[PDB]
């Protein structure tokens, strides 16, 4: 492992290389200017970005002495050995040659004083401080640290002379991810039809080890598609097939469609399968959503050419059972950006100040794996109007909405995050949310009309055997006031009658008959009420 | 143990078997493809599922060294000792030969490093992270984990290189396979049918089946040794297994009287999707899920739900209306989410929500803290019943006595599509016959006369009359005679008034007209 293994962080790599190499390769410059170089690095960032890999690279390349210290491995049973261990380690490091020290998980042996108990922790922290910067502090020794939670470190350790340059090794961009993919696939034998440039673009939040996992999974799938076809050959491996190995593009696509970024492993959404053809009617809304979603991500050069950021938020409102969550499902299924589904009251908590910690966590997750689609379902619950309630519920339900206000439009770096809202009482959300910059465009999704409802029926029966002489237009012209869910129910009842007939006969009937479908239509429902549809109509008119 | 001692977890067992053994059987393949194999597995599922059994079986089938580490065992109060214990364990595992490390219950020693306050927990977490990944971390040795809640683990631990693979180890055929493999070493009997066992024990994790078989076998000898060639003709029968099960309701399509069309509709709509998944896949459509019952109280809605739940191999989770509300902020919604997560975690399952008038309440607007709580509960219920879910197999069944106070978002098709109305002397005859199934009857009593004098009673009233007759019979003893019915008939209640009947009739007429 050398400096070429690590890719995607050329800036940070150079930032570390300068102080690790130039003082040891060309020290004439610093004596000519008469300033000693910085001596201390704190690599931070999300887990797996390549901090330990960068330490390994700088260790294997430089000819200087390298000493490894792990975090919890320094302290021992008896009182006064953690400090003795640190003393011996630093003495050995400085005894012989210019040396590099590397502390894995410095957060495990550098807790913030004034908030931790146990005297041994304080004593070892103080010993580390004295070793790194005290009287006769150091003599040509460099220290490197690696952590995932820099804020949980003693501020006395994050000072010049101890940790002066804190390099941020974070998630790569598209070019960095492309570089990571190309480096990881240098020894694995692939197929000529595999293109790395396209494959890197679909991945958005995959950082380092995530990409490695993708590669490994693809190879495993390729092994399991054809190894099973051939004899196991436990005695020996046939040479002819070994030269036939490779990885095809379909393997990479399959492995990609299963994997998710390691950051968003806890919030993984179940594999629900919907497609744009499965949503009938409301084509203009479909095209508008596609425009507002996939123009920012597929054509960012245009937006910077015009020098403007894109619009982000959308809110569907309308009568229940029309395709709001269905549109959310379709977006989640056939869009490159990551999806984080959240239910309405799912984020609220028993304790004080935890619903806001939950909101903070999910929105930081969204900003880390940008571009991302955050689908807030039933916004009418958490986004209640502030107004006046005079109660602890009012106090807690007012604090939660205020966190949402500052998270969507606050002090953030304009990262790509598209918020989709879905409510059924749009009059009961504070106007501070129904504003451009939070949810700019408010899409009303009425009940389907004759053409739209007919298209819905055609979409619903995509994979249903039907008689050649069936005329769905007639049932569509004799329906009024229905919703897509009601037509779905009609389809379900027709299928159930067909199944009843098939079981009674028991392929006696390889299709749904017009008689079965008429029997199903006999018990029409008309889910939504006309007494209550006027509320939506008045709200839209206003 | 061996691979033959595992049943039901076929696909995940095969996946773990191949991912562990392919490197061991021949590394030339991975050398040729030039990629290193996965070296970590996070098993998660309810306790007693067979996860450690699977790990042990894989370790036994291969030339490995199964080393077990318990969660609470390694954690200690001394400073710098638990980390030393983990380091010693890993050094031992890597020292001898390529081995399998099974660290059980990592959730006890992985508190996410933010919600914890003890420094030893964070220190051991960091030690685990350094051991799994780092400079020369692992050299041909794999680690297996186990937990009930996989969420309460460090994100750094659920990374690639530490726990790159997560396996869900949660049915009828697997349960039957476990029954077959757990009774392989004992000659039970010739007339014992395992279909009833695989259908009746519909809520057994898999480690409880071994206990059930052992208990039945022990009780067979316990009952066959009071008086005592003896070794000949030994083994368990159906009676021993039934007793073991006795040591989750007892109804089968008989305790309900009348309402034949309602019974047939429920039976069809519940059994069709369970018996014939192939037909629906051929037709390419999902089944209906929701049913709502409304009418006067004490009519048998709970009885009907139990009677339609019993014939299938599904579970039964009955929850009362106000039996979930709490004074805290977000506890009711947490309870609802837990209930539905349990319901969909064991498919198939029928959930019986009782007194929807208490939960739904037609949220609208109330302008109060109770109003906000009701709004949040209604929204959570709406999202869970039909939202960003998979709806594998869940049959929500509602039951209320005031459907007018329900919002038109739960009555919507796809959530509670079927609006069934539950409303006679001929029906009362069947009700009395079903109630008096196992009872010593007199030839001289005429149930027709008893039913003729009801004129608007409910099944609760009939059960009360039967209970009074039984009390009189027991008083006389300390068969049922006619004079007990004669004296018990005068003390009728007729708790259901007349105005509510008019309200129900008006609601039914409005629904029919709609």
């Amino acid at each position: 492992v050398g400096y070429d293994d690590i890719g995607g962080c050329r800036k940070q790599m150079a930032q570390i290389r300068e102080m690790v190499e130039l003082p040891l390769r060309h020290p004439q410059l610093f004596k000519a200017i008469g300033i000693k170089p910085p001596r201390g690095v704190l690599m931070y960032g999300p887990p797996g970005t390549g901090k330990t890999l960068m330490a390994r690279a700088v260790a294997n390349e430089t000819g200087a002495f390298f000493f490894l210290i792990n975090g919890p491995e320094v302290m021992s049973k008896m009182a006064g050995e953690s400090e003795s261990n640190l003393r011996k380690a630093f003495e050995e490091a400085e005894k012989n040659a210019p040396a590099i020290i590397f502390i894995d998980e410095i957060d495990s042996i550098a807790p913030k004083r004034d908030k931790t108990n146990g005297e041994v922790e304080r004593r070892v922290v103080s010993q580390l401080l004295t070793l790194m910067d005290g009287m006769k502090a150091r003599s040509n020794v460099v220290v490197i640290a690696a952590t995932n939670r820099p804020n949980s470190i003693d501020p006395a350790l994050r000072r010049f002379g101890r940790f002066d340059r804190e390099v941020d090794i974070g998630i790569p961009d598209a070019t960095g991810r492309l570089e990571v993919l190309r480096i990881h696939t240098k020894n694995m034998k692939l197929a000529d039809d595999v293109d790395l440039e396209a494959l890197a673009a679909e991945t958005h939040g995959y950082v380092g080890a995530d990409i490695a996992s993708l590669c490994s999974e693809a190879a495993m799938q390729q092994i399991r598609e054809k190894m099973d076809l051939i004899d196991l050959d436990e005695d020996e491996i046939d040479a002819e097939v070994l030269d036939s190995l490779g990885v095809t593009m379909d393997n990479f696509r399959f492995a990609l469609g299963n994997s998710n970024p390691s950051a968003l492993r806890e919030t993984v959404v179940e594999s629900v399968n919907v497609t744009w053809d499965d949503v009938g009617g409301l084509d203009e809304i479909k095209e508008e959503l596609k425009e507002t979603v996939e123009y920012p991500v597929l054509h960012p050069d245009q937006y910077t050419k015009f020098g403007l950021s894109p619009s982000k938020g959308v809110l569907f409102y309308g009568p229940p059972g029309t395709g709001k969550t269905l549109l959310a499902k379709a977006v989640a299924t056939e869009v490159s950006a990551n999806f984080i589904s959240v239910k309405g009251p799912e984020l609220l908590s028993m304790w004080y100040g935890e619903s806001e910690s939950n909101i903070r966590d999910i929105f930081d997750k969204a900003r880390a794996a940008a571009p991302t689609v955050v689908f807030l379902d039933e916004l009418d619950s958490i986004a209640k109007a502030r107004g006046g309630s005079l109660g602890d519920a009012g106090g807690a339900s007012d604090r939660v909405v205020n966190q949402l206000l500052t998270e969507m439009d606050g002090m953030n770096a304009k990262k790509n995050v598209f918020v989709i809202g879905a409510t059924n009482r749009p009059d009961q959300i504070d106007p501070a949310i129904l504003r451009p910059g939070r949810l700019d465009q408010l899409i009303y999704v009425p009940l389907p009309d004759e053409n739209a409802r007919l298209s819905i029926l055609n979409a619903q029966l995509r994979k249903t055997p039907l008689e050649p002489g069936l005329e769905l237009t007639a049932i569509a012209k004799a329906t009024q006031g229905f919703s897509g869910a009601d037509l779905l129910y009609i389809v379900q009842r027709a299928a159930k009658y067909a199944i009843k007939d098939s079981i009674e006969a028991h392929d006696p009937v390889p299709y749904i008959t017009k008689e079965h479908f008429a029997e199903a239509m006999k018990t029409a429902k008309r889910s939504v009420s006309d007494a209550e549809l006027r509320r939506y109509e008045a709200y839209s008119q206003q | 143990v061996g691979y033959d001692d595992i049943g039901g977890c076929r696909k995940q067992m095969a996946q773990i078997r191949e991912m562990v053994e392919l490197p061991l059987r021949h590394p030339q393949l991975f050398k040729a493809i030039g990629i290193k194999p996965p070296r970590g597995v996070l098993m998660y599922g309810p306790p007693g599922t067979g996860k450690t059994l699977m790990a042990r079986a894989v370790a036994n089938e291969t030339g490995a060294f199964f080393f077990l580490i318990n969660g609470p065992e390694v954690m200690s109060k001394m400073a710098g000792e638990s980390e030393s214990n983990l380091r010693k364990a890993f050094e031992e595992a890597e020292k001898n030969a390529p081995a399998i490390i099974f660290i059980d219950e990592i959730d006890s020693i992985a508190p996410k490093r933010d919600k914890t306050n003890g420094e030893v927990e964070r220190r051991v977490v960091s030690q685990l992270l350094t051991l799994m990944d780092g400079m020369k971390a692992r050299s041909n040795v794999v680690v297996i984990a186990a937990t009930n809640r996989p969420n309460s683990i460090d994100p750094a631990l659920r990374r690639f290189g530490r726990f790159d693979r997560e396996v869900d180890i949660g049915d009828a055929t697997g349960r039957l396979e476990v029954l077959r493999i757990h009774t392989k070493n004992m000659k039970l009997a010739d007339d014992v049918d395992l279909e009833a066992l695989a259908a009746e024990t519909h809520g057994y994790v898999g480690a409880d089946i071994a206990s059930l078989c052992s208990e039945a076998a022990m009780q067979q000898i316990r009952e066959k040794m009071d008086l005592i060639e003896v070794l000949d003709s030994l083994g368990v029968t159906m009676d021993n297994f039934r007793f073991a099960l006795g040591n989750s309701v007892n109804v089968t399509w008989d305790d309900v009287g009348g309402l034949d069309e309602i019974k047939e509709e429920l039976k069809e709509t519940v059994e069709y999707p369970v018996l014939h998944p192939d037909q629906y896949t051929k037709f390419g459509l999902s089944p209906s899920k929701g049913v709502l019952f409304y009418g006067p109280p004490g009519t048998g809605k709970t009885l009907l739900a139990k009677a339609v739940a019993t014939e299938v191999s599904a579970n039964f989770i009955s929850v009362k209306g106000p039996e979930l509300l709490s004074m805290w902020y977000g506890e009711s919604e947490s309870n609802i989410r837990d209930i539905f997560d349990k319901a969909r975690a064991a498919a198939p399952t029928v959930v019986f929500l009782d007194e929807l008038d208490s939960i739904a309440k037609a949220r609208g607007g109330s302008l109060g803290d109770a109003g906000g709580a009701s709004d949040r509960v209604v929204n959570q219920l709406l999202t869970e019943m039909d939202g960003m879910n998979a709806k594998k197999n869940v049959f929500v069944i509602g039951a209320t006595n005031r459907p007018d106070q329900i919002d038109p978002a739960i009555l919507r098709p796809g959530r509670l599509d079927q609006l069934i109305y539950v409303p006679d002397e001929n029906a009362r005859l069947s009700i009395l016959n079903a109630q008096l199934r196992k009872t010593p009857l007199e030839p001289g009593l005429e149930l027709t006369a008893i039913a003729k004098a009801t004129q608007g009673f409910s099944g609760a009233d009939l059960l009360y009359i039967v209970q009074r007759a039984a009390k009189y019979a027991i008083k006389d003893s300390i068969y049922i005679t006619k004079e007990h019915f004669a004296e018990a008939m005068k003390t009728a209640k007729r708790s259901v008034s007349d105005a509510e009947l008019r309200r129900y009739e008006a609601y039914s007429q409005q629904m029919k007209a709609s």
Partner: peptide, 23 residues
């Protein structure tokens, strides 16, 4: 001759949390 040694590892503390009531 024998010798002694001192050791002081840690202790156990108790925290207090705040809850929110929705009436």
């Amino acid at each position: 001759a024998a010798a002694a040694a001192a050791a002081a590892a840690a202790a156990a503390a108790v925290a207090v949390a705040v809850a929110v009531a929705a009436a």
